[PDB]
Ligand binder design. Sequence first.
Ligand code: NAP
Ligand code: FOL
Length: 159
Amino acid sequence: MISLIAALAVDRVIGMENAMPWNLPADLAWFKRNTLNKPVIMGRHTWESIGRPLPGRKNIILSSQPGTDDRVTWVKSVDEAIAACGDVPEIMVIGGGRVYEQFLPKAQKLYLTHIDAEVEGDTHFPDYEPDDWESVFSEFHDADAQNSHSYCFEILERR
Ligand SMILES: NC(=O)c1ccc[n+]([C@@H]2O[C@H](COP(=O)([O-])OP(=O)(O)OC[C@H]3O[C@@H](n4cnc5c(N)ncnc54)[C@H](OP(=O)(O)O)[C@@H]3O)[C@@H](O)[C@H]2O)c1
Ligand SMILES: Nc1nc(=O)c2nc(CNc3ccc(C(=O)N[C@@H](CCC(=O)O)C(=O)O)cc3)cnc2[nH]1
């Protein structure tokens, strides 16, 4: 079972040239609890964004090019990424856009944070045909002194 986890602003924006213009420590906490002790598949750009391996997660990095960090596992295809996660209850695909697009059709679950932020971005979460997905969990939060925007955690399971 493959799951995607992603934080989307409006128009499904997940990435832009520069850092996201927001501060959303609850979504980071959500990301950590939903990925904890699970293999994480990411693209090389996301790997570079994160800086270091996510602790206590098997980290699997897609690149067409040889790896450049022996702390993590490097694979050259989607199927190699999955195989590299081994035999686990849940693989988390943590992005970015190229990676999500390739994994969404394979995924049984989505963990999406919907952030009420107006951002122009070059990278977007894939369209998930909502007839293919059932929302099983939805939890809205206003912005607050720690979180710059309102946001909603959603879990969807593939029909
Ligand atoms: N011209 C464009 O508009 C364009 C197109 C694509 C990306 N970008 C830029 O990249 C940034 C973020 O991109 P993102 O979030 O899409 O990155 P991402 O998915 O985290 O990382 C993408 C990288 O992951 C690797 N990858 C993904 N799928 C793979 C596969 N099946 N096999 C082998 N390697 C695979 C490739 O690394 P290697 O690069 O090492 O092969 C690829 O370049 C954005 O700022 C965006 O503008 C721009
Ligand atoms: N809900 C959600 N929120 C996100 O911020 C998110 N980010 C990505 C990809 N980018 C990143 C960037 C940094 C870290 C990261 O370093 N997380 C730490 C928390 C500590 C910190 O921010 O320095 C972690 O251990 O999980 C993770 C993913 C993928 N899915 C997401 N999904």
